[PDB]
Structures are given as structure tokens and as C-alpha cells.
């Protein structure tokens, strides 16, 4: 329609055409709602949004991810076998829609558990990396200490060298 | 509307949904400056599964001329006096989901020579 | 208001990370004006962490620094420039990710 | 690892969808599909058997990061103190080589 | 639905330092000319 | 100065371009009954 590849430079640059001291300063940290791109992308939010918002939760608050992921893997294979069973008996039965909906529900809980794991991994990475950094600094310090002794070894070699010449 | 040769119109959302009849449809849209809201091409947007509207009775129409499956899709604007009678008006070529108007031989040569002189 | 200023400046800086938009501005002659270089110098406030916290597309910041060298804006009017810079950007991105993945997988499969 | 796990979960479904599709659409196909599903299911299981229940991540995470900050500071001091004295060596020991060079050239 | 890997070293480079150490440097090597040394190191290299 | 590519560049808009309207938002069909009687031109370099 009428719009081009967006309106070109305007407003802030017009303001900017000044000298020495006249241009406006930077904007404050709007700690609320903004409009980057098209999404609102407002501040103050979590990393993995609870599955309770938008879908049912089939898992209790114990949530031992390792055990529940293993159960969910089993439920999915068993539910596939039941979907094959609906095909044996009545392809048109109402349950076919439910079984197709129930298997999808299971595939989504596995992704929510994977999302719990990603921060479990962010937290672990924040914890380590500085452990590798720690060891590398100590090793680099040991190398310098050893190099200096070897440089002092060279100093004593030079002392031996004066009698060596005499 | 100043110079139709110097205008380009696109829509990134339409670019993924693109191939053959899709091209005719995109051109058919409305907001494209080349497409007229008058003439006969507007009434094909109103008609459904039409298969021969340009012949028996006539008028300004837009028809695909040559097509390369991925990107290249050339469109031609015809004015029919009667069935089996075609008069070509202009050609609009779409490269990479970007519509341009095909430059004339003489007009393009002359303007570019004026830039060189 | 200052809110609209912040939002428009954030959108503009995030948009500057596009080589197509940079070539657009360079060809249209916006860089030659001495007002735009002062606007760019003012835009350096995004390097602060409190301001960088709101940047969704971080690839812009580094690019912004290049725009201050005064030789990056004299060039880049060419389309081959945008071609090459976007090529290297997408190449770094995709090759880093998929090459790490493929190297790990191939080494794990070959060592076995 | 986690991306591989997600892709494996998605594929576990791929072999279900594909299996049923094939069915609606001979014996070797069902055999290979069954083998495929069972193989990838066991792989998903053994991959899940990897990431652990886990613990700390704060209490121990915070304590460890604080200790690491302290030790980074002390290691920086040790490496520099060595470094001031390391660079000290080359500083006037190359001037001792220049004294020897000056005495040789003055001859 | 799949969620992907975190930036990790990338986010670290973003939040602490600003000089992006990722992608290619060939941008600067091919487009930006080098800055010349002052007398401090001109003559220093002279005496080395 | 850059790889295999047309060895020529111009002023600015060989042709100037434009764009459509905000697509996320738009109207509806509101229909009525009849009453009652291949390649890829992507930036990724080709082998």
C-alpha cells in the first residue's frame, strides 16, 4: 500500500542538528512496557513460564524431573499403542480425537521439563567456568614461578660461567 | 503515482506463501499501485473459479506470461477487443518477491545516457 | 515524552544491526550530514548495562562502534558491502552453532 | 545434549506419525518402523538417565562463586607480584646486555 | 515448542564487555584502516 | 573487495520501493447465503 520500507531518518536527528551544547540527553530506563519490533516485550518476567498458564498439568508438585520424564516417555509409547487399538475397534469413535489430543499433551510436558533443565544448566554454567578459569590462573602462576626459578637457574648458570671462563 | 517505473511494492508476510497461481493472487491484492481498482481485473477478484473471463467479453486484464518456480514470475497487462484479440499494454516482473515495471528500451537508454552526459 | 524517545531510539538502534538498512541510509545520504554523526555519538549510551538490558538484538552494539570510525560511513554505499557483511554475520552465526554440534557428534561417532 | 534430547523426543513422535501414515497408505516396513521406534525410545531413556536430580545451584552456588571471587583476587595478586618482578628482570638485564654492548663498541 | 541453548559466554561478553568477540573481524580489517603509533612507541621500537 | 558478484553498484534507489499495511490486524470475510430460492535466491552462498 502507501507505506514505503519505513519512514526515513526524522525527529531525533532534526533535534541533533545543533552544536556544542544543545542536543537532548539519553532517555531513562523505562522499567515497564516497551514496543520493540511488534511484540510488547515488557520487563519483569520469568524464564520458563509455568505450563499451568495455557494448558493442563498432569504432574504433581514433587516434580522429580528424572522420574516424571521417564513416566511421560512410557505414557507416550502406551498411548500410541492405544491409538492403534482405537484403529482396531472403531476408527470413527469419539475417543480417536481425545487420544490424538492426549498424546500431544504428553509431548508438551516433556518440553516443560526440558525448560526446567535449561536453567538447571544456566545455573550450573554460572557456577562452573570460573572453576576452569580458577585452575588456569593457578597453572599460569605455577608456570611463571617455575620459569623464574629456571631464569634463576640461568642466573646460577651464568655464575658457573664466570669460573667456567676463569 | 509520480513514476510507475520508479516504484517497488512488497509484503514480507506474502513472500513465504508464493509460487504460481499464488502470484496471480498477490498481484490481484489491491494496494499494489500497478493493480487498478477499476477495469476488469478487479471483477476477477469478485468472481470465483473463473477459467476464461478474458475472451468472450473483454477489458483490461493481468495474466502471467513466464514463470520460474522459485522467484521469477512475469506478469503482462493486456487489453482485449474481442476473444482471440490481445493487445499488450505493459509488463511487470517480480524478482525475489519484489515487483518492478519492465523498463522500455528507448526510455531506459535515454535517461541513463542523460545521467552519463 | 521521554518514553517515546526511549522506544524510538531502541527500535532505531536494533534496526541499525541490519546491513540493508545501513546501505539504505548510506545511499540516501543521511551519513554525510554532520548531524547524524552527533546523533550516533549520543546513541553510545546503550553500552551501559542498564540500557543494554533492554536490547533484544545485541548484534547492533558492535556495529555501532564501527560507525564511529568515520571510514565505515564513507564506504558501505555499495550493495556488495551489505552482501559481504550479512554473509559473514550469518556465516559466523550458523556455522558456529551447527559446526560445534556436528564436530561433537562426528567425533563421538568416530571415536567409538 | 539438551537440543539432542529435544530432537530425540520429537523424532520418537516422527516414527509414530510415520508408522501410522505408512499403515493407512509391507512387513519389512512395519519391522523397520518398530525397530526404529524401539531404538530411539531406548536412546531417549538412556539420555534422560543422564541429566541428574541435581542440588546446590545457589546455596552451594553462592558459596562457590564467593570463594572463587576471593581466590581470583588472590591469584591475580600473586601472578602480578611475580610479574612486576618478572618484568624487572628483563628491564635492566637487557640494559646489562647494552652495557656489555657499549663496552664492546667503545673498544 | 522446543526451547534452545542459552547465550552463556556470549551473554557474558555482552553484559560485562561490549567489544563483540564473536563473528568475523575481517569486517574491520577490510573496511577500517589501522591507527598509527605515536612517538612513545615509534622511537621505542627504534631503540629495540 | 568482495566475492563473485556483479561488478557494479549505483547511486541509491535504482527504483524506490514501498510496502503494504500492518498485516497482524485486518477485517474478516463476513459472507452471506444465497437467500432462499525449484531453487533458492537466499543469501547463504551456493556450493
Amino acid at each position: 500500500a502507501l507505506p514505503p520500507p519505513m519512514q526515513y531518518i526524522k525527529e531525533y536527528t532534526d533535534e541533533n542538528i545543533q552544536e556544542g551544547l544543545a542536543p537532548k540527553p539519553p532517555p531513562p530506563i523505562k522499567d515497564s512496557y516497551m514496543m520493540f519490533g511488534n511484540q510488547f516485550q515488557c520487563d519483569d518476567l520469568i524464564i520458563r513460564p509455568l505450563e499451568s498458564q495455557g494448558i493442563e498439568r498432569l504432574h504433581p508438585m514433587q516434580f522429580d524431573h528424572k522420574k516424571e520424564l521417564r513416566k511421560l516417555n512410557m505414557s507416550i509409547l502406551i498411548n500410541f499403542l492405544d491409538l492403534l487399538d482405537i484403529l482396531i475397534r472403531s476408527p470413527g469413535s469419539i475417543k480417536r480425537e481425545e487420544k490424538l489430543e492426549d498424546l500431544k499433551l504428553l509431548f508438551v510436558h516433556v518440553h516443560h521439563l526440558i525448560n526446567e533443565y535449561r536453567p538447571h544448566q544456566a545455573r550450573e554454567t554460572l557456577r562452573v567456568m570460573m572453576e576452569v578459569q580458577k585452575r588456569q590462573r593457578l597453572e599460569t602462576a605455577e608456570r611463571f614461578q617455575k620459569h623464574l626459578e629456571r631464569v634463576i637457574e640461568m642466573i646460577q648458570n651464568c655464575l658457573a660461567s664466570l669460573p667456567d671462563d676463569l | 503515482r509520480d513514476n510507475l517505473l520508479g516504484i517497488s511494492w512488497v509484503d514480507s508476510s506474502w513472500i513465504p506463501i508464493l509460487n504460481s497461481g499464488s502470484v496471480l493472487d498477490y498481484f490481484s491484492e489491491r494496494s499494489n499501485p500497478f493493480y487498478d481498482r477499476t477495469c476488469n481485473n478487479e471483477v476477477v477478484k469478485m468472481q470465483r473459479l473463473t477459467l476464461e473471463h478474458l475472451n468472450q467479453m473483454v477489458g483490461i486484464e493481468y495474466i502471467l506470461l513466464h514463470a520460474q518456480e522459485p522467484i521469477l514470475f512475469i506478469i503482462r497487462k493486456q487489453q482485449r477487443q474481442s476473444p482471440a484479440q490481445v493487445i499488450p499494454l505493459a509488463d511487470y516482473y517480480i524478482i525475489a518477491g519484489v515487483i518492478y515495471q519492465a523498463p522500455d528500451l528507448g526510455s531506459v537508454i535515454n535517461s541513463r545516457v542523460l545521467t552519463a552526459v | 515524552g521521554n518514553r517515546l524517545r526511549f522506544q524510538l531510539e531502541l527500535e532505531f538502534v536494533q534496526c541499525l544491526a541490519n546491513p540493508n538498512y545501513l546501505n539504505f541510509l548510506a545511499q540516501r545520504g543521511y551519513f554525510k550530514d554532520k548531524a547524524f554523526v552527533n546523533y550516533l555519538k549520543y546513541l553510545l549510551y546503550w553500552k551501559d548495562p542498564e540500557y543494554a538490558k533492554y536490547l533484544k538484538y545485541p548484534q547492533c552494539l558492535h556495529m555501532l562502534e564501527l560507525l564511529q570510525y568515520e571510514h565505515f560511513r564513507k564506504e558501505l554505499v555499495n550493495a556488495q558491502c551489505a552482501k559481504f557483511i550479512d554473509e559473514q554475520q550469518i556465516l559466523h552465526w550458523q556455522h558456529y552453532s551447527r559446526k560445534r554440534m556436528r564436530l561433537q557428534q562426528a567425533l563421538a561417532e568416530q571415536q567409538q | 545434549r539438551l537440543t539432542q534430547l529435544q530432537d530425540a523426543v520429537n523424532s520418537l513422535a516422527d516414527q509414530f506419525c510415520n508408522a501410522i501414515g505408512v499403515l493407512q497408505q509391507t512387513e519389512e516396513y512395519a519391522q523397520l518402523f518398530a525397530a526404529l521406534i524401539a531404538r530411539t525410545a531406548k536412546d531417549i531413556d538412556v539420555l534422560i538417565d543422564s541429566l541428574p536430580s541435581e542440588e546446590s545451584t545457589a546455596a552451594l552456588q553462592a558459596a562457590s562463586l564467593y570463594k572463587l571471587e576471593e581466590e581470583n583476587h588472590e591469584a591475580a595478586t600473586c601472578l602480578e607480584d611475580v610479574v612486576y618482578r618478572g618484568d624487572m628482570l628483563l628491564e635492566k638485564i637487557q640494559s646489562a646486555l647494552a652495557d656489555i654492548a657499549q663496552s664492546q663498541l667503545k673498544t | 515448542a522446543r526451547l534452545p541453548s542459552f547465550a552463556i559466554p556470549y551473554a557474558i561478553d555482552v553484559l560485562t564487555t561490549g567489544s563483540y568477540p564473536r563473528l568475523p573481524t575481517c569486517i574491520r580489517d577490510k573496511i577500517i584502516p589501522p591507527d598509527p603509533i605515536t612517538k612513545i612507541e615509534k622511537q621505542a621500537t627504534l631503540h629495540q | 573487495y568482495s566475492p563473485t558478484s556483479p561488478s557494479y553498484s549505483p547511486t541509491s534507489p535504482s527504483y524506490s520501493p514501498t510496502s503494504p499495511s500492518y498485516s497482524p490486524t485486518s477485517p474478516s470475510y463476513s459472507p452471506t447465503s444465497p437467500s432462499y430460492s525449484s531453487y533458492s535466491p537466499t543469501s547463504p552462498s551456493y556450493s
Binding site: 507505506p3 | - | 527500535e11 532505531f12 554475520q89 550458523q94 | - | - | 547463504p44
Partner: peptide, 30 residues
């Protein structure tokens, strides 16, 4: 980087022209 990212893939590292057009700087200035 997307797992399925491919040469035809539209998603790109700059802010993307299409997002600039619908973006506030593109529309609010007009």
C-alpha cells in the same frame, strides 16, 4: 541459530526490514 535454519530461511541477524516497517520508528515518524 535455529536448528532448521536454512539458506532460504527468512530469519536474519539485523533487526529485519519487515520488523523495521511495522516498527515504531518506521510508522510513528510517518
Amino acid at each position: 541459530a535455529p536448528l532448521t535454519w536454512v539458506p532460504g530461511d527468512p530469519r536474519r541477524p539485523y533487526p529485519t526490514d519487515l520488523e523495521m516497517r511495522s516498527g515504531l520508528l518506521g510508522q510513528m515518524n510517518n
